[PDB]
């Protein structure tokens, strides 16, 4: 039983991506202090405990599922598509999410507001003509006051429907005050849609849409995400735990039940001695 760890994560042979102050979703959306993580790839994404959010207060229903599937895809390669939003103002932002010196927003999301004094029923489409899945990340804005709702969106109550040939997903945004986070009582709800190859995506919304700017190229492979404060190191090891890299010469380990790579199996016993000699009968 391997019961000790070196305390550091070996950066080979696995493509490690240390997320400094960035969560997976924060790096995905494009938080300013996560701008360095655009188009990154990894074999194992290491997520530090010190990661924080510094943008519009959002919320991800089924956050674990999205984190799991993004980690499994193993890439943050984002292809911007040309969406044509007619009759609305694009690239909305706020001073709670300060990109550069001025107000800003997530770099992968487009906040569409009313143009002039109207908000038409946006109805856009994108076909998936490629032979890989596309991941579209969109959102719904929940304002704090009805005055804000009508000031941003001429409709008194918008709705957002995102659909494919096989499934649909509709959200009725609500207006209400919420706990104060970074100066705001309004929220974003983050949803995702997977467009399989040869399928089409249709977005029909009459208000409160935080539209996508493109798609994330989905992949299949040996990628995952880990929560660990172990420091990265320049070294060789096939088995990674939150406690660092460990040698995989022994068949069992008692360090952690969370493992990655060609790792030993986790057992509750800290020691199991296997005799490699004969019965020992000494003199006297």
């Amino acid at each position, epitope marked *: 039983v391997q019961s000790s760890s070196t*305390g*550091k994560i070996c950066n080979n042979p696995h493509r490690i991506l240390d997320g400094i102050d960035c969560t997976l979703i924060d790096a995905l959306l494009g938080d300013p202090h996560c701008d360095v993580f655009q188009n990154e790839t990894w074999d194992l994404f290491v997520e*530090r*405990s*010190k*990661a*924080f959010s510094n943008c519009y207060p959002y919320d991800v229903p089924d956050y674990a599922s999205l984190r799991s599937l993004v980690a499994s895809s193993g890439t943050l390669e984002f292809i911007t598509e040309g969406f044509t939003w007619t009759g609305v103002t694009q690239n909305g932002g706020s001073n709670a999410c300060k990109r550069g010196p001025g107000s800003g927003f997530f770099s992968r999301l487009n906040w569409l507001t009313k143009s002039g004094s109207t908000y038409p029923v946006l109805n856009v489409t994108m076909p998936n003509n490629d032979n890989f899945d596309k991941l579209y990340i969109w959102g719904v804005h929940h304002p704090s006051t009805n005055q804000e709702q009508t000031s941003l969106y001429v409709q008194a109550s918008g709705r957002v429907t995102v659909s494919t040939r096989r499934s649909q997903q509709t959200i009725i945004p609500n207006i209400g005050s919420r706990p104060w986070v970074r100066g705001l009582s309004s929220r974003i709800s983050i949803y995702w849609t997977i467009v399989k190859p040869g399928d089409v995506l249709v977005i029909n919304s009459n208000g409160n849409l935080i539209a996508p700017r493109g798609y994330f190229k989905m992949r299949t492979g040996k990628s995952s995400i880990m*929560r*660990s*404060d*172990a*420091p990265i190191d320049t070294c060789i090891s096939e088995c990674i*735990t*939150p*406690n*660092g890299s460990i040698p995989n010469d022994k068949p069992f380990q008692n360090v*952690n039940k969370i493992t990655y790579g060609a790792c030993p199996k986790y057992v509750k016993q800290n020691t199991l001695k296997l005799a490699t000699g004969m019965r020992n009968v000494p003199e006297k």
Partner: antibody
Amino acid sequence: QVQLVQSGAEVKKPGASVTVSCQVSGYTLTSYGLSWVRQAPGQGLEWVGWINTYDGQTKYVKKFQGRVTMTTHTGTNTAYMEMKSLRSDDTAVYYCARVEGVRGVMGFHYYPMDVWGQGTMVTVSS
Amino acid sequence: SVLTQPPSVSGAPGQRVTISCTGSSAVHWYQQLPGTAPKLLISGNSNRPSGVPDRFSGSKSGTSASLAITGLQAEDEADYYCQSSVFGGGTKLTVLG
């Protein structure tokens, strides 16, 4: 802005017990571990101990074992260090410093104390 | 396990200072200004954190780490400690006219 705000100076008598507090600001207490470091006046820095917030596991020096207790009030983003069986020699300035690792590793092995408090002059003597 | 260190360095503003620490077993250099909390000057034996001027530097040989201060001026005059858990003995850096 990341800030550690410590208690006021304490004047005690030998054999008592004292409780110093450290209020964090600009970040979440359970994201970072917290070391406590004493400095007698003009006698150089001295590592006292380390609390792993978010799981409550401690680490004190053998010199301080049994008579020092560290706790965290996560509701108020506060950490407390109490020194029991105060002696005259325990008069020193105590600092709470922020250390990085809390999950998978004990942070003080691999990470520095990047943010310090103003320190409290705990004087148990006269 | 033990850290050693030159005890006191007296110098004018504007020149180089080399301090050495000898770690028996990550070494970090801290500065304590007089009547102020200590500050982290370098981590990882060679990395300066945010806000530390690039004049500060660190070099690591097999067992001896060395902190070099360049363009010395007023605020550099302080006490300097090496850390690896155990602390160094301290190194007073006085100004000299």
